[PDB]
Amino acid sequence: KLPPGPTPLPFIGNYLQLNTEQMYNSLMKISERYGPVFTIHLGPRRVVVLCGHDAVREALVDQAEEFSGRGEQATFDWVFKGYGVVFSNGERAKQLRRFSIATLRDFGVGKRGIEERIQEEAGFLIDALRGTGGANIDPTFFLSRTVSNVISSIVFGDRFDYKDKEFLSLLRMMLGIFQFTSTSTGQLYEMFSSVMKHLPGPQQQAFQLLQGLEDFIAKKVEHNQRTLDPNSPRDFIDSFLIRMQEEEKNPNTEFYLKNLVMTTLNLFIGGTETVSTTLRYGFLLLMKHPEVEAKVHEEIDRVIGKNRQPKFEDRAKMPYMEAVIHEIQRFGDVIPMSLARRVKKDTKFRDFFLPKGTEVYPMLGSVLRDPSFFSNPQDFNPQHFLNEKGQFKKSDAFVPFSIGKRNCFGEGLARMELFLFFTTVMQNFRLKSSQSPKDIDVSPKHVGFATIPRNYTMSFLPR
Numbered sequence: 001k002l003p004p005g006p007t008p009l010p011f012i013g014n015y016l017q018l019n020t021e022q023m024y025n026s027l028m029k030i031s032e033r034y035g036p037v038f039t040i041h042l043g044p045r046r047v048v049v050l051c052g053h054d055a056v057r058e059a060l061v062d063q064a065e066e067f068s069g070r071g072e073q074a075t076f077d078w079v080f081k082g083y084g085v086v087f088s089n090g091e092r093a094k095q096l097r098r099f100s101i102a103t104l105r106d107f108g109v110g111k112r113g114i115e116e117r118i119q120e121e122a123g124f125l126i127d128a129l130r131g132t133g134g135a136n137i138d139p140t141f142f143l144s145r146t147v148s149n150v151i152s153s154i155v156f157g158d159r160f161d162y163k164d165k166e167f168l169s170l171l172r173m174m175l176g177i178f179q180f181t182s183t184s185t186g187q188l189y190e191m192f193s194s195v196m197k198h199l200p201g202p203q204q205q206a207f208q209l210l211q212g213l214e215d216f217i218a219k220k221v222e223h224n225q226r227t228l229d230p231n232s233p234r235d236f237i238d239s240f241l242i243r244m245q246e247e248e249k250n251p252n253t254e255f256y257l258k259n260l261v262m263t264t265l266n267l268f269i270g271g272t273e274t275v276s277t278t279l280r281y282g283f284l285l286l287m288k289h290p291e292v293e294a295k296v297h298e299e300i301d302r303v304i305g306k307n308r309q310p311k312f313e314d315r316a317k318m319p320y321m322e323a324v325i326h327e328i329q330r331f332g333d334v335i336p337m338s339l340a341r342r343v344k345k346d347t348k349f350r351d352f353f354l355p356k357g358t359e360v361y362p363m364l365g366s367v368l369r370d371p372s373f374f375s376n377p378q379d380f381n382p383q384h385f386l387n388e389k390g391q392f393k394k395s396d397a398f399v400p401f402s403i404g405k406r407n408c409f410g411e412g413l414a415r416m417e418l419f420l421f422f423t424t425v426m427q428n429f430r431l432k433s434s435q436s437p438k439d440i441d442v443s444p445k446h447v448g449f450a451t452i453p454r455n456y457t458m459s460f461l462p463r
């Protein structure tokens with residue numbers, strides 16, 4: 001009655017069928033044998049796996065409510081423990097998601113306000129990139145300081161100074177955690193956390209980075225409590241603390257300190273790491289494909305010029321830039337197995353029985369690379385989202401933010417960030433790799449919870 005899958009052994013589950021260094025490939029290799037919907041055992045953790053566009057959409061959209069429960073990511077749940085928007089369920093999820101979405105809008109997300117903040121911030125990236133004097137540099141922290149400063153703008157009330165040593169520290173913590181969760185040890189941790197959380201190893205270093213990010217948030221919150229004005233909120237934290245006051249006589253309220261610290265931490269991490277990684281992978285992809293970079297320059301110079309900052313409405317007159325970013329996201333596949341979902345109830349799904357609480361892995365990478373939706377799925381080719389005529393061609397398999405009821409509500413900010421950061425860098429600079437185009441490896445360095453591109457250096461040269 002459960003979907004078919006390979007026979008597990010007691011406790012270790014399907015250990016013998018999985019290579020934890022390549023979870024995505026192992027699962028895809030299993031899906032080739034069993035079909036697109038299968039049951040896998042991550043140790044004693046039973047998970048149903050959805051591969052391909054049709055399986056992912058049929059579950060997450062066509063049966064949206066049923067598949068709207070949140071599952072586990074054990075590394076991250078070490079600190080969160082079900083608190084905060086991302087890892088919450090039921091009433092807690094309803095309440096925090098509604099609040100988060102509305103308070104981000106109040107602070108300019110999808111509005112003129114945040115567009116101005118992003119333009120300013122891009123401005124500061126531009127100056128910082130000129131300041132290398134065309135140097136061969138690691139762009140990791142330049143990109144990530146810039147990106148993080150936007151969400152930090154919204155949640156903490158001010159940006160970080162690029163020279164701030166504590167800022168760099170947090171960014172290393174973030175990079176560190178995503179790194180770990182995409183290593184074989186990270187993925188074994190997903191299978192055997194109840195043992196491994198008590199064992200020395202890279203787990204312990206990852207928990208310590210998570211604890212450092214937690215301590216920094218709770219000290220930012222403590223500061224806000226001590227200085228709050230209930231009639232003029234400075235930031236997201238302020239808004240949340242005001243609601244905590246209004247709610248202190250509701251006995252069943254989800255608005256309390258632990259949910260504030262953990263939601264704020266979801267936002268800070270969310271709004272920092274994915275867009276940053278996307279950009280870094282982006283500049284690698286473009287350096288590997290000079291023909292695509294040249295076509296980008298052409299369009300920016302024609303539609304925008306050189307005399308001003310790019311804006312968000314510029315998107316509508318720029319078919320090719322939209323297709324490069326969509327293709328960057330589709331190739332990049334930054335979060336390849338989504339965040340895990342779970343069935344809210346005993347559930348019937350295309351002739352299988354899913355008991356209440358069964359964890360579900362929507363293989364977003366299998367949709368981004370579904371050969372029914374994309375011609376040569378393993379090639380970076382911006383034409384994947386283009387008319388024969390050259391107009392922007394959408395895709396139902398374009399799913400890097402997932403779909404359904406618990407879909408990324410950061411999509412709006414991220415899309416605005418990607419566009420303005422990519423064009424404003426492209427307008428002001430051309431990209432020059434440390435090796436020739438043919439010797440650049442664009443294959444990932446780590447794939448697990450995230451797709452992590454290889455360490456590289458590059459140069460930014462003015463036009």
Ligand code: HEM
Binds near residue numbers: 270341
């Ligand atoms: C390149 C950019 C981004 C990518 C690829 C991405 C990807 C994802 C994915 C795959 C999920 C899981 C959704 C699901 O379970 O169906 C998610 C959820 C989430 N994301 Fe993002 N995201 C991005 C940007 C952002 C930004 C900028 C923020 C914060 C401003 C953010 C915050 C969140 C939050 C809070 C959730 C939890 C949704 C929920 O459980 O209700 N993300 N994102």
Ligand SMILES: CC[C@@H]1C(=O)OC[C@@H]1Cc1cncn1C
Binds near residue numbers: 086265269273274339
């Ligand atoms: C594993 C959950 C991570 C967290 O703490 O909150 C969001 C984050 C994952 C994520 C979702 N959207 C972008 N990111 C980087």
